[PDB]
Design a protein around this ligand. Sequence first.
Ligand SMILES: CCOC(=O)C1=C(CN2CCN3C(=O)N(CC(C)(C)C(=O)O)C[C@@H]3C2)NC(c2nccs2)=N[C@H]1c1cccc(F)c1C
Ligand SMILES: CCOC(=O)C1=C(CN2CCN3C(=O)N(CC(C)(C)C(=O)O)C[C@@H]3C2)NC(c2nccs2)=N[C@H]1c1cccc(F)c1C
Ligand SMILES: CCOC(=O)C1=C(CN2CCN3C(=O)N(CC(C)(C)C(=O)O)C[C@@H]3C2)NC(c2nccs2)=N[C@H]1c1cccc(F)c1C
Ligand SMILES: CCOC(=O)C1=C(CN2CCN3C(=O)N(CC(C)(C)C(=O)O)C[C@@H]3C2)NC(c2nccs2)=N[C@H]1c1cccc(F)c1C
Ligand SMILES: CCOC(=O)C1=C(CN2CCN3C(=O)N(CC(C)(C)C(=O)O)C[C@@H]3C2)NC(c2nccs2)=N[C@H]1c1cccc(F)c1C
Ligand SMILES: CCOC(=O)C1=C(CN2CCN3C(=O)N(CC(C)(C)C(=O)O)C[C@@H]3C2)NC(c2nccs2)=N[C@H]1c1cccc(F)c1C
Ligand SMILES: [Cl-]
Ligand SMILES: [Cl-]
Ligand SMILES: [Cl-]
Ligand SMILES: [Cl-]
Ligand SMILES: [Cl-]
Lengths: 155, 149, 148, 150, 155, 148
Amino acid sequence: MDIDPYKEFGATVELLSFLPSDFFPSVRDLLDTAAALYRDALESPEHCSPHHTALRQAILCWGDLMTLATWVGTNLEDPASRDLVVSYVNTNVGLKFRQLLWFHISCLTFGRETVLEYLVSFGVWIRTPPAARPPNAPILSTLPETTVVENLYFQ
Amino acid sequence: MDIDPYKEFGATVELLSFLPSDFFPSVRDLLDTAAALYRDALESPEHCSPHHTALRQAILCWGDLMTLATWVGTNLEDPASRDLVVSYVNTNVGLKFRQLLWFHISCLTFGRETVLEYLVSFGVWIRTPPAARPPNAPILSTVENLYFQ
Amino acid sequence: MDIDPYKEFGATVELLSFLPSDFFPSVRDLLDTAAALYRDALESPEHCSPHHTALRQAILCWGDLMTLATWVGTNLEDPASRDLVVSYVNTNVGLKFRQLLWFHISCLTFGRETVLEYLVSFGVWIRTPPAARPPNAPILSTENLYFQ
Amino acid sequence: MDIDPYKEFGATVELLSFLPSDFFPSVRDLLDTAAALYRDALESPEHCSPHHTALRQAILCWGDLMTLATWVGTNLEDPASRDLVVSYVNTNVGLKFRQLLWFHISCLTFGRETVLEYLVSFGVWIRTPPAARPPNAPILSTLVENLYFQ
Amino acid sequence: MDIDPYKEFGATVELLSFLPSDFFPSVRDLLDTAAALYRDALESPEHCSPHHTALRQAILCWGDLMTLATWVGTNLEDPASRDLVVSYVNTNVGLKFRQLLWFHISCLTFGRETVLEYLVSFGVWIRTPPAARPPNAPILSTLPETTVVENLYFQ
Amino acid sequence: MDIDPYKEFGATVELLSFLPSDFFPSVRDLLDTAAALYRDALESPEHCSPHHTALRQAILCWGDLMTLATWVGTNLEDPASRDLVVSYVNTNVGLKFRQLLWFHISCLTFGRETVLEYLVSFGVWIRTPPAARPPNAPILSTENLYFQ
Ligand SMILES: CCOC(=O)C1=C(CN2CCN3C(=O)N(CC(C)(C)C(=O)O)C[C@@H]3C2)NC(c2nccs2)=N[C@H]1c1cccc(F)c1C
Ligand SMILES: CCOC(=O)C1=C(CN2CCN3C(=O)N(CC(C)(C)C(=O)O)C[C@@H]3C2)NC(c2nccs2)=N[C@H]1c1cccc(F)c1C
Ligand SMILES: CCOC(=O)C1=C(CN2CCN3C(=O)N(CC(C)(C)C(=O)O)C[C@@H]3C2)NC(c2nccs2)=N[C@H]1c1cccc(F)c1C
Ligand SMILES: CCOC(=O)C1=C(CN2CCN3C(=O)N(CC(C)(C)C(=O)O)C[C@@H]3C2)NC(c2nccs2)=N[C@H]1c1cccc(F)c1C
Ligand SMILES: CCOC(=O)C1=C(CN2CCN3C(=O)N(CC(C)(C)C(=O)O)C[C@@H]3C2)NC(c2nccs2)=N[C@H]1c1cccc(F)c1C
Ligand SMILES: CCOC(=O)C1=C(CN2CCN3C(=O)N(CC(C)(C)C(=O)O)C[C@@H]3C2)NC(c2nccs2)=N[C@H]1c1cccc(F)c1C
Ligand SMILES: [Cl-]
Ligand SMILES: [Cl-]
Ligand SMILES: [Cl-]
Ligand SMILES: [Cl-]
Ligand SMILES: [Cl-]
């Protein structure tokens, strides 16, 4: 099968690939943030949303990879090679999970449309030559809960 | 965090662990069954169901685990050592994914209630001594006169 | 005192003894089934039933027995006598607890009469010569309030 | 599973463990008291109460531990005092059963509320320094129409 | 800063000092009593009372002190010097926490006034020569606010 | 007992531990700020607030800890282990008290909801890669005669 984990969420692997690897927080920091903001939802008996369901699996999958990588490492006769398999996972699959965790955590806070627009905004900014672009990166931020039109309507 | 992947689906890790490892099809056979029955839905831009969403991730996660386990296996000296990794996968994370893939595929066909009832039925049958129990395993499956007047 | 643990549940040690030891699931499998089916009730602050009360104590007692048996195994100077302890447990107190756990778990699922009738049914079948009896064993198949 | 045998009776292992081991009668004396006061009920075909059901199992469980201990001493000991196994049992699991038998026998006589209050009363008394506390321990105890005189 | 932990509770360090060290249960026995009587309240999300808030911190502080003393003790190889750490705890900070835990646990059960009156009663009794005083110590108990006659009068 | 000192104040240890250790002022700087802003309230015979009650105990507890550490340090044989005591304080109990003192002092100034929101804001900012985030950290922030 050819399954793109972003496709049911309105995105693609190629679109997440538009961002440089340096854009994404680390796996540990994504996992810490998922816990700080969404632990209760993620641990609840309710689906909550497709993003929650996917994020739960992504978190556990990283755990599966690290548990396997740690176990083999303990079996490597060279004690200096203890985290060699763990390093292998980070090198070849770490970026994939950073993209995926970032996507779901961000979508849960900002909504798909805002996240996808930000992906484009940053990817265009980082491809503009540094001496020709605004010094600071674009900012990821939430939409207003109420529009100016609605606010003025109820004056 | 402590996330139980079955909890949002009305089950638990402990409940799936009630079944012996020999109960489950192999991961390869589970993956081939998911493809034969649900490939178009799994590859679609539609969520379809929480089971589809979870199953998509599990399928992809197993691919990651196999690339890792294959990399360790193909780069490991000694047949006994590679036997150990294959054994470790068989005993631990392979069993986890056999449970998980079986659960989601079965739920997509029979519904949660039927699946959970079958888990108990088989788990009780296999714990009954063979000489005392029915020879075959339990099976997973799904008008008045007035009516004619 | 002479207490029969089955007496308040309508049975006796003698009746459970009518079944061959091979009839019963293992202690481990009985404990796993009690957890799979009744963990929440067994761990709850509610009595639930006399079967739950008895089953709670039986589960804890087996833990006590295993801790004692482990201490005997580790403290016996001779390795051959450790073997005797295990075989003694399997033959004697392990069988007692297989009977007891099976009885209460089955009663919680099927009710007292069905269980008592099944004990007799299987005990009669296994005593019928194999070449003269049905090829398969009889089947165990089908509450909230408890009088005295 | 994590089963607390006191939980269905409104108590916990931790609560019983608030009492020092010296608080409790010996297992033998608890068993003699169960027999003297409740033998007929314990041996009857009636449930009687959840306390009776639990007490029956606890009495039989101690029998199982002692039968095991005695059998090892008889068969697997020669010049050993053959009381080595029996001695370990009374050292570790004996306290657990003194708590359990005492709880059920006391509840059958005084009721849960009075028993739990007494556990707290004695636990506080024994933790008060002896030279600062009352000399005697707290005590476990529990407690006509007008027309007649007109 | 010079803070007296009793001042917001109507007492002082000097007043608790009026009681001899032998008056107090050990820290362990005070902690075990706090758990037996107040565990649910102490672990709850509600303030409950200023005594509860203070008692919560005292329990945790003792944990901090013993964890530090343990780490020092277990990482000191000479056994005599480990006994020096224990003696320092017993001599100095153990008495401070025995006073403090006793005060808060007693106040939660009997109220401030009864506790302070009892502090005085015992401190006076123990300073009376043993051959001249009642054989038994005064008793900590809640006194009745009204007499039987008064209670019957307002029936 | 398992007491979370933040629980009665609407937070948890895990939430405070979302912030990196470098976020917090030193214990000394927290204590000096508490004295500059709240000394009279803290030394008063009035409860003032649950935050004041908790903060009083934390201040005294730090005094207990440092005298113990000083007594150990001044009686230790070799400076390398004197350095070990300081390092233990810096890594373990100093971090706990930096979190705790900061929480109470900040709550007394800004209120719980502002503090908890700021914790999240900074914790997310510091986890954003430096080259991708705003250059500055988020900020913690909140006649008489004519009407006679
Ligand atoms: C937790 C939700 O995610 C965010 O809020 C995320 C953010 C939100 N932004 C964080 C940095 N920023 C501030 O501090 N701001 C300050 C203020 C005052 C609020 C404002 O000016 O508006 C704005 C800006 C907002 N940025 C990003 C990324 N930016 C670039 C590359 S990555 N990723 C995630 C994220 C981050 C860390 C861990 C995670 F796990 C995740 C998912
Ligand atoms: C595809 C949905 O799953 C099933 O249908 C599943 C089945 C369905 N059963 C298959 C075997 N059976 C028949 O052929 N039957 C024939 C008939 C005519 C209908 C009848 O006699 O009633 C009944 C019985 C039904 N059994 C199981 C398991 N049984 C025991 C241990 S495992 N697991 C899954 C499953 C299986 C393979 C790959 C998968 F990937 C999965 C998930
Ligand atoms: C969990 C309740 O117990 C049972 O259900 C028990 C059973 C239930 N039976 C299990 C075997 N069977 C099937 O799979 N059946 C299939 C079907 C379709 C439902 C039907 O034909 O009706 C019937 C038959 C029913 N049998 C027994 C024993 N039989 C003989 C000796 S022992 N003991 C217990 C038990 C078992 C294991 C662990 C335990 F822990 C216990 C207690
Ligand atoms: C049999 C019910 O239990 C009791 O009555 C129990 C008692 C009852 N008390 C017995 C001692 N007492 C008297 O003699 N009293 C005499 C009188 C005239 C009424 C008075 O002076 O007031 C009061 C006082 C009541 N005390 C206790 C415990 N106290 C402290 C630690 S243990 N445990 C159990 C118990 C005891 C033994 C074997 C058991 F098996 C048990 C269970
Ligand atoms: C738990 C509340 O504290 C008490 O109840 C406290 C008590 C209560 N007293 C306990 C001793 N007593 C009884 O048993 N009494 C009842 C009795 C036997 C029926 C009778 O009247 O003769 C009265 C008398 C009341 N005494 C004390 C202290 N007394 C002297 C020095 S210290 N300190 C605390 C306390 C105690 C232990 C652990 C703690 F942790 C604490 C705090
Ligand atoms: C004393 C109350 O606490 C504060 O005010 C606290 C602050 C207040 N902030 C101080 C730094 N800032 C300014 O100078 N600002 C300038 C101005 C003009 C007023 C504005 O733009 O608003 C804003 C910003 C506000 N920041 C913090 C922390 N920020 C980041 C990590 S820690 N912690 C505490 C605190 C600090 C020191 C000792 C303590 F002890 C404590 C508790
Ligand atoms: Cl095949
Ligand atoms: Cl009698
Ligand atoms: Cl409580
Ligand atoms: Cl006295
Ligand atoms: Cl001031």
